[PDB]
């Protein structure tokens, strides 16, 4: 992996399912000027991952007030993401999303971020906080069974923005 | 940058630590096989973000004990510097008495093994690692220098890994 604290976060260009439900090719560099929370989850149509994704989506406004873009990603195809979004939450899907979901079918983004579980071809639960300069500020990687906290992620984003202010 | 990989044995180390009783002891990560371990790096002694974290982990050590989890802190400073900070009154910015050991990594090889050395400065980033009772690395956390870690979040992770170890 090439993700190093204090260095530019590895860029990517990938197809995402955008909040409007439609495909768009996006790049991490598209969000320079904003903080970014970039998180991986292992795969679509699973048990723990939708709880995390929906939590980040539901609370997207709290990141927007921090000028912070949230982006999720898995090695699934962009069609698989679309299927999951188009499946209602009450039927085990994601439902409508407030955040883009990146597809990493070549596994190169997960590799660049050091979160590929090589023996399965899927990502660990990696989460990365990138500042408005594109510099990586925080690395979080959970083994597959344990999910992430939106509260903790907001705490971190808020703290980096506060400490960015001292000069 | 490091040999710390999720699902692999956490890199072993043997290093001098200042123990809670205020004495120096050479300890190894492998000493704690059979228990979960929270192993965290902080950049330097006699600083001003690090003490909030260290004191919080020490103050709340009993919550980790109830999870059968050992907490270990570490920085590149000498163990003598660690003890000097422990022995500095809290009212003057010291750590005060500690409930957790503080490892000294003067060769920077432990930080390098865990992939958290800030190479242009010779100090560790704020790396935190959750290691299960079999020695396997389960969680990686690395913060840039200015931003501290949360004991609440660390407890949540340790307990959650332990729960999923028993039933998934
Ligand atoms: O002791 C600290 C930082 C203490 C501090 C003091 C006064 C502040 O005013 C302040 C902070 C916090 C901070 O991180 O400042 C640093 C350094 C700095 C301070 C003032 C400046 O003007 C400047 O330019 C640069 C930064 O931002 O780089 C942040 C803060 C954070 C939480 C709060 O609750 C709060 O109130 C304020 O503001 O850290 C070291 C680590 C370490 C090792 C080597 C480095 O070389 C190094 O940089 C850092 C550790 O703890 O081991």
Swiss-Prot record, chain B:
- What GO terms are given for molecular function? cadherin binding; identical protein binding; peroxidase activity; RNA binding; thioredoxin peroxidase activity
**Keyword Signal on this protein?**
no
For this chain's UniProt record, which GO biological process terms are given?
canonical NF-kappaB signal transduction; cell population proliferation; cell redox homeostasis; erythrocyte homeostasis; fibroblast proliferation; hydrogen peroxide catabolic process; leukocyte activation; natural killer cell activation
Query: Which reaction(s) are listed as its catalytic activity?
Result: a hydroperoxide + [thioredoxin]-dithiol = an alcohol + [thioredoxin]-disulfide + H2O
Give the Enzyme Commission number. 1.11.1.24
What sequence ranges are listed for the domain Thioredoxin?
A: 4-163
* Keyword field: Acetylation, Antioxidant, Cytoplasm, Disulfide bond, Isopeptide bond, Oxidoreductase, Peroxidase, Phosphoprotein, Redox-active center, Ubl conjugation
Cellular-component GO terms for this entry = cytoplasm; cytosol; extracellular exosome; extracellular space; melanosome; nucleus
Instruction: State the post-translational modifications.
Output: Phosphorylated on Thr-88 during the M-phase, which leads to a more than 80% decrease in enzymatic activity. Acetylation increases reducing activity and resistance to superoxidation. Deacetylated by HDAC6 which decreases reducing activity.
Q: Where is this cross-link: Glycyl lysine isopeptide (Lys-Gly) (interchain with G-Cter in SUMO2)?
A: 5, 118
| Residue list for modification Phosphothreonine | 88
Residues bearing PTM Phosphoserine: 30
Q: Which residues carry this modification: N6-succinyllysine?
A: 33
Q: Where is the active site?
A: 50
> Its principal location?
cytoplasm
Where in or outside the cell it occurs: the entry states: Cytoplasm; Melanosome
Decide whether keyword Lyase is in the record: no
Function, as annotated: Thiol-specific peroxidase that catalyzes the reduction of hydrogen peroxide and organic hydroperoxides to water and alcohols, respectively. Plays a role in cell protection against oxidative stress by detoxifying peroxides and as sensor of hydrogen peroxide-mediated signaling events. Might participate in the signaling cascades of growth factors and tumor necrosis factor-alpha by regulating the intracellular concentrations of H(2)O(2). Reduces an intramolecular disulfide bond in GDPD5 that gates the ability to GDPD5 to drive postmitotic motor neuron differentiation.
Subunit structure of this chain's protein: Homodimer; disulfide-linked, upon oxidation. 5 homodimers assemble to form a ring-like decamer. Interacts with GDPD5; forms a mixed-disulfide with GDPD5. Interacts with SESN1 and SESN2. Interacts with FAM107A.
Family recorded in the similarity comment: Belongs to the peroxiredoxin family. AhpC/Prx1 subfamily.
Q: Which named protein is this? A: Peroxiredoxin-1
This protein's species is: Homo sapiens (Human)
Whole sequence portion shown: 3 to 170 of 199
